[PDB]
Amino acid sequence: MVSKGEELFTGVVPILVELDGDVNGHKFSVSGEGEGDATYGKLTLKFISTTGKLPVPWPTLVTTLVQCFARYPDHMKQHDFFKSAMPEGYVQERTIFFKDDGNYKTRAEVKFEGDTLVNRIELKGIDFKEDGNILGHKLEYNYFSGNVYITADKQKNGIKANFKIRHNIEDGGVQLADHYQQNTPIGDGPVLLPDNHYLSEQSKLSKDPNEKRDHMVLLEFVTAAGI
C-alpha cells in the first residue's frame, strides 16, 4: 500500500529554502524557491543571497541547500525515511570537513508548511583559511555528483549518512568536502528505517542572465540505489 508521507510527493511540490550562515564571522542569508518532482527525482531551484556577495563559494552550499525529493525505486519504497517523516518533518544535521581547511556545521528543519516543502537551515563555519579555496573563492562553478551512503540509526529512530564531494579548483585540482550526516524525525510518529543504500545525486549550477543579485540556479537529480 502507499504510506502516509509518500502520497504528499506524487506530483510537483513547491519548495522554499531559507539559510542563515556565519563563516569565520562573515554573516550571510540565502533564500531559495523552486519545485520538486519525487517521481523523477528532479529539483529545480533558484537561490539568492539577501546579504550581498556570499563569503563562500555557491558550490560549497549545494549539499546544505530536501532529500525527501529522492526518486526511490518501487522495490526500495519501504526504505524511504525522508518521505515517511512527513508532513511533521525531520531535523538534518551535518559536519562538512573541508580537507586542509575549516568545517561547516549545519542544522536544518525540513517540513511542510501547507502545500510548500520548507527547508530552514542554520550554518556555522569555523577555522577557515583567509587565502584557502573557500574564503578565497577558488572553486569552479559547473557540475558535481555525489553518492550519499545511508544507514539506519535505530538508536535515534533516524538515519546517518557519509559521503565525499570533490569540488574542482580553478587550478585543476580538487577540494575534498567530507560529509557526516544525521536525520531524526520531528514527529513522535513512526518512520521507515532503511537498509544500507545510497542516493546518487547530480547537481548542475547555472546563472540567471537577468539577475544582478549574487545567486545560483540549480538543477538536481537524486535517485536511490543499491538494493
Q: Domain ranges in the chain?
A: 12-225
Report resolution (Å) to 1 decimal.
1.7
Q: Which residues contact 32 (CB under 8 A, 6 or more apart)?
A: 15, 16, 17, 18, 19, 45, 46, 47, 48, 65, 119
- The owner of cell 502516509 is 4
Third-level CATH fold of 12-225: Green Fluorescent Protein (2.40.155)
For the chain, the farthest-separated pair of C-alpha atoms sits apart, in whole angstroms, at 54
Sheet strands (E) in the chain = 12-23, 26-37, 42-49, 90-98, 103-113, 116-126, 143-153, 158-168, 174-185, 197-206, 215-225
Cβ(103)–Cβ(94) below 8 Å:
no
Q: Which residues contact 30 (CB under 8 A, 6 or more apart)?
A: 17, 18, 19, 21, 47, 48, 49, 50, 54, 61, 65
Cell of 38: 519525487
Cα 110 to Cα 177: distance, rounded to the nearest angstrom: 23
Q: Contacts by 173-178 with C-beta closer than 8 Å and gap 24+?
A: 175/98, 175/99, 175/101, 175/133, 175/134, 175/138, 175/139, 176/98, 176/99, 177/60, 177/63, 177/96, 177/97, 177/98, 177/99, 178/96, 178/97, 178/99
Torsion from C-alpha of 102, 170, 54, 97, nearest 10 degrees: -20
Cα 65 to Cα 159: distance, rounded to the nearest angstrom: 19
SS3 159: strand
Q: In sequence order, which ranges of the chain are alpha helices (DSSP H)?
A: 81-84
User: What's the chain's Rg over C-alpha atoms?
Assistant: 17
